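P.,

For your records, the input lines for the assembly:
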Amino acid sequence: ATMSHTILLVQPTKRPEGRTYADYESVNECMEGVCKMYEEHLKRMNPNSPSITYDISQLFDFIDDLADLSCLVYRADTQTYQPYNKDWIKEKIYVLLRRQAQ
Amino acid sequence: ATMSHTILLVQPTKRPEGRTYADYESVNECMEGVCKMYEEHLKRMNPNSPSITYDISQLFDFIDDLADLSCLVYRADTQTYQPYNKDWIKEKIYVLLRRQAQ
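Structure tokens returned:
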């Protein structure tokens, strides 16, 4: 399925407080959501800018600073959600951006 | 598996804001978590009481007031998470409490 419902789980600290999630229609939209979450963090540091560019290493460092980050992707074959860890998310984003033109 | 990792997804309103989740070692612990979430809500309404009892209909009304509530239960056979909706959670809690002695 090109578009599989995806659930992003964000765990900022080691505790049960502040754990949040978001729902997306696809893995692609989900990966953009991870990037949008970083962009929003950056926008808080530069309140007057329309958008802040960044390198992937900062984004990955950011993802690494979370107590945890993971996603769940719906699989039509089993009607269940396949889980993927933070490293899988980073690779995914990497490949999706590397598709600047590679 | 008597103890399957369970993820509780709470969506208080129709929007992406405020969606939160919690991780539990079993479906049982998860159902207690749903009840604990209501109890904490009740404790805010009666700040001086150690604990507030309630009937199941109020708890269910409460669950029904959420834009959404669902859980995901890990299945060792497929290494994926089985999703269940709010009605499944309510029945589950119902049966677990009905086990006062029935």
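Two observations worth noting. Chain B touches chain A through 15 residues (CB under 8 Å). The radius of gyration of chain B is 14 Å.

Regards
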